Write a protein that holds these residues in place. Structure first.
Motif, PDB file in Angstrom:
ATOM      1  N   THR A   1       0.838  -1.199   0.000  1.00  0.00           N
ATOM      2  CA  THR A   1       0.000   0.000   0.000  1.00  0.00           C
ATOM      3  C   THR A   1       0.883   1.263   0.000  1.00  0.00           C
ATOM      4  O   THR A   1       2.083   1.296   0.248  1.00  0.00           O
ATOM      5  CB  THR A   1      -0.875   0.038   1.248  1.00  0.00           C
ATOM      6  OG1 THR A   1      -0.077   0.126   2.425  1.00  0.00           O
ATOM      7  CG2 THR A   1      -1.714  -1.206   1.309  1.00  0.00           C
ATOM      8  N   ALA A   2       0.240   2.374  -0.300  1.00  0.00           N
ATOM      9  CA  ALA A   2       0.932   3.707  -0.334  1.00  0.00           C
ATOM     10  C   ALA A   2       1.379   4.063   1.078  1.00  0.00           C
ATOM     11  O   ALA A   2       2.433   4.586   1.363  1.00  0.00           O
ATOM     12  CB  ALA A   2      -0.105   4.737  -0.800  1.00  0.00           C
ATOM     13  N   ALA A   3       0.663   3.714   2.111  1.00  0.00           N
ATOM     14  CA  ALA A   3       1.061   4.018   3.501  1.00  0.00           C
ATOM     15  C   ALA A   3       2.237   3.116   3.889  1.00  0.00           C
ATOM     16  O   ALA A   3       3.075   3.687   4.569  1.00  0.00           O
ATOM     17  CB  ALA A   3      -0.122   3.669   4.425  1.00  0.00           C
ATOM     18  N   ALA A   4       2.238   1.838   3.494  1.00  0.00           N
ATOM     19  CA  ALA A   4       3.360   0.957   3.826  1.00  0.00           C
ATOM     20  C   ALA A   4       4.603   1.382   3.055  1.00  0.00           C
ATOM     21  O   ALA A   4       5.738   1.341   3.557  1.00  0.00           O
ATOM     22  CB  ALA A   4       3.026  -0.487   3.551  1.00  0.00           C
ATOM     23  N   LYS A   5       4.423   1.799   1.823  1.00  0.00           N
ATOM     24  CA  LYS A   5       5.563   2.279   1.005  1.00  0.00           C
ATOM     25  C   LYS A   5       6.145   3.540   1.661  1.00  0.00           C
ATOM     26  O   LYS A   5       7.363   3.739   1.760  1.00  0.00           O
ATOM     27  CB  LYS A   5       5.015   2.664  -0.385  1.00  0.00           C
ATOM     28  CG  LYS A   5       6.178   3.217  -1.197  1.00  0.00           C
ATOM     29  CD  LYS A   5       5.778   3.680  -2.580  1.00  0.00           C
ATOM     30  CE  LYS A   5       7.037   3.446  -3.429  1.00  0.00           C
ATOM     31  NZ  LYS A   5       7.324   4.687  -4.161  1.00  0.00           N
ATOM     32  N   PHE A   6       5.340   4.486   2.155  1.00  0.00           N
ATOM     33  CA  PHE A   6       5.907   5.677   2.876  1.00  0.00           C
ATOM     34  C   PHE A   6       6.667   5.177   4.100  1.00  0.00           C
ATOM     35  O   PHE A   6       7.778   5.746   4.311  1.00  0.00           O
ATOM     36  CB  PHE A   6       4.721   6.551   3.335  1.00  0.00           C
ATOM     37  CG  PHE A   6       5.157   7.800   4.130  1.00  0.00           C
ATOM     38  CD1 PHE A   6       5.367   7.696   5.506  1.00  0.00           C
ATOM     39  CD2 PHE A   6       5.425   9.004   3.510  1.00  0.00           C
ATOM     40  CE1 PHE A   6       5.809   8.750   6.256  1.00  0.00           C
ATOM     41  CE2 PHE A   6       5.864  10.115   4.217  1.00  0.00           C
ATOM     42  CZ  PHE A   6       6.050   9.948   5.587  1.00  0.00           C
ATOM     43  N   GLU A   7       6.195   4.232   4.910  1.00  0.00           N
ATOM     44  CA  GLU A   7       7.018   3.748   6.015  1.00  0.00           C
ATOM     45  C   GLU A   7       8.348   3.175   5.521  1.00  0.00           C
ATOM     46  O   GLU A   7       9.428   3.346   6.111  1.00  0.00           O
ATOM     47  CB  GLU A   7       6.286   2.667   6.808  1.00  0.00           C
ATOM     48  CG  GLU A   7       5.048   3.271   7.459  1.00  0.00           C
ATOM     49  CD  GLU A   7       4.421   2.213   8.367  1.00  0.00           C
ATOM     50  OE1 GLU A   7       5.140   1.346   8.917  1.00  0.00           O
ATOM     51  OE2 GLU A   7       3.200   2.332   8.512  1.00  0.00           O
ATOM     52  N   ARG A   8       8.369   2.415   4.449  1.00  0.00           N
ATOM     53  CA  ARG A   8       9.609   1.761   3.975  1.00  0.00           C
ATOM     54  C   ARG A   8      10.559   2.784   3.412  1.00  0.00           C
ATOM     55  O   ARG A   8      11.792   2.712   3.615  1.00  0.00           O
ATOM     56  CB  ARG A   8       9.215   0.779   2.811  1.00  0.00           C
ATOM     57  CG  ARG A   8      10.420   0.106   2.193  1.00  0.00           C
ATOM     58  CD  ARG A   8      10.064  -1.070   1.255  1.00  0.00           C
ATOM     59  NE  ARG A   8       9.161  -0.658   0.156  1.00  0.00           N
ATOM     60  CZ  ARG A   8       9.651  -0.090  -0.959  1.00  0.00           C
ATOM     61  NH1 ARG A   8      10.897   0.245  -1.288  1.00  0.00           N
ATOM     62  NH2 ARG A   8       8.687   0.203  -1.821  1.00  0.00           N
ATOM     63  N   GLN A   9      10.002   3.750   2.708  1.00  0.00           N
ATOM     64  CA  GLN A   9      10.904   4.737   2.081  1.00  0.00           C
ATOM     65  C   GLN A   9      11.298   5.822   3.092  1.00  0.00           C
ATOM     66  O   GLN A   9      12.383   6.332   2.794  1.00  0.00           O
ATOM     67  CB  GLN A   9      10.102   5.459   0.952  1.00  0.00           C
ATOM     68  CG  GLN A   9       9.894   4.483  -0.207  1.00  0.00           C
ATOM     69  CD  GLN A   9       9.570   5.223  -1.515  1.00  0.00           C
ATOM     70  OE1 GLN A   9       8.762   6.281  -1.499  1.00  0.00           O
ATOM     71  NE2 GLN A   9      10.129   4.789  -2.629  1.00  0.00           N
ATOM     72  N   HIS A  10      10.561   6.213   4.101  1.00  0.00           N
ATOM     73  CA  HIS A  10      10.888   7.421   4.838  1.00  0.00           C
ATOM     74  C   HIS A  10      10.976   7.207   6.338  1.00  0.00           C
ATOM     75  O   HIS A  10      11.311   8.313   6.896  1.00  0.00           O
ATOM     76  CB  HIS A  10       9.756   8.485   4.600  1.00  0.00           C
ATOM     77  CG  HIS A  10       9.698   8.878   3.109  1.00  0.00           C
ATOM     78  ND1 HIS A  10      10.763   9.524   2.462  1.00  0.00           N
ATOM     79  CD2 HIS A  10       8.688   8.693   2.179  1.00  0.00           C
ATOM     80  CE1 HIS A  10      10.476   9.729   1.109  1.00  0.00           C
ATOM     81  NE2 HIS A  10       9.198   9.202   0.981  1.00  0.00           N
ATOM     82  N   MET A  11      10.653   6.056   6.904  1.00  0.00           N
ATOM     83  CA  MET A  11      10.723   6.124   8.387  1.00  0.00           C
ATOM     84  C   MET A  11      11.923   5.312   8.882  1.00  0.00           C
ATOM     85  O   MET A  11      12.131   4.231   8.358  1.00  0.00           O
ATOM     86  CB  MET A  11       9.449   5.468   8.965  1.00  0.00           C
ATOM     87  CG  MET A  11       8.152   6.241   8.718  1.00  0.00           C
ATOM     88  SD  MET A  11       8.204   7.876   9.545  1.00  0.00           S
ATOM     89  CE  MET A  11       8.732   7.426  11.245  1.00  0.00           C
ATOM     90  N   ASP A  12      12.618   5.925   9.868  1.00  0.00           N
ATOM     91  CA  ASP A  12      13.678   5.128  10.560  1.00  0.00           C
ATOM     92  C   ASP A  12      13.604   5.508  12.054  1.00  0.00           C
ATOM     93  O   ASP A  12      14.352   6.342  12.571  1.00  0.00           O
ATOM     94  CB  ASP A  12      15.054   5.485  10.002  1.00  0.00           C
ATOM     95  CG  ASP A  12      16.077   4.558  10.674  1.00  0.00           C
ATOM     96  OD1 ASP A  12      15.643   3.692  11.460  1.00  0.00           O
ATOM     97  OD2 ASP A  12      17.281   4.679  10.451  1.00  0.00           O
ATOM     98  N   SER A  13      12.651   4.872  12.734  1.00  0.00           N
ATOM     99  CA  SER A  13      12.378   5.088  14.194  1.00  0.00           C
ATOM    100  C   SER A  13      13.480   4.393  15.010  1.00  0.00           C
ATOM    101  O   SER A  13      13.495   4.545  16.240  1.00  0.00           O
ATOM    102  CB  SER A  13      11.069   4.330  14.512  1.00  0.00           C
ATOM    103  OG  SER A  13      10.007   4.994  13.804  1.00  0.00           O
TER     104      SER A  13
END
Length: 124
Positions: A3-15
């Motif tokens: 999904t577009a929300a999962a793709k934003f987590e993979r591309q932009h989040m590093d918690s």
């Protein structure tokens, strides 16, 4: 498919990290997150915050996206981010980036229900 929300987590989040720790951070993260699979993506930003704080931006300052769309939101607080920009020696498949760490407000585009970030617009 992703999904577009999962793709934003993979591309932009590093918690998992508070900030980039060395000049190699972009090289390792662009590769491990699969952003250099078909080609070298020229720029990308990672955000070092909890996913709840980044999802909350969708209910913060509504602003126009750089392309004119009006479903963009600007964070009220600055966030820890890492900018990754392709260098002069970068050549597929050995994509090479310069790592830059900064503290800025972020701008994302949100969609759906729940309403969450799906595109990283800019940092300011």
């Amino acid at each position: 498919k992703e999904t577009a929300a999962a793709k934003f987590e993979r591309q932009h989040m590093d918690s998992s990290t508070s900030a980039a720790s060395s000049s190699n951070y972009c090289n390792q993260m662009m590769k491990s997150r699969n952003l250099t699979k078909d080609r070298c993506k020229p720029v990308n930003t990672f955000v070092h915050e909890s996913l709840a704080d980044v999802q909350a931006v969708c209910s913060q300052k509504n602003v126009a996206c750089k392309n004119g769309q009006t479903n963009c939101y600007q964070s009220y607080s600055t966030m820890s981010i890492t900018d990754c920009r392709e260098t002069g020696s970068s050549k597929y498949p050995n994509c090479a980036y310069k790592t830059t760490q900064a503290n800025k407000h972020i701008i994302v585009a949100c969609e759906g229900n729940p309403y969450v970030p799906v595109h990283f617009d800019a940092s300011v």
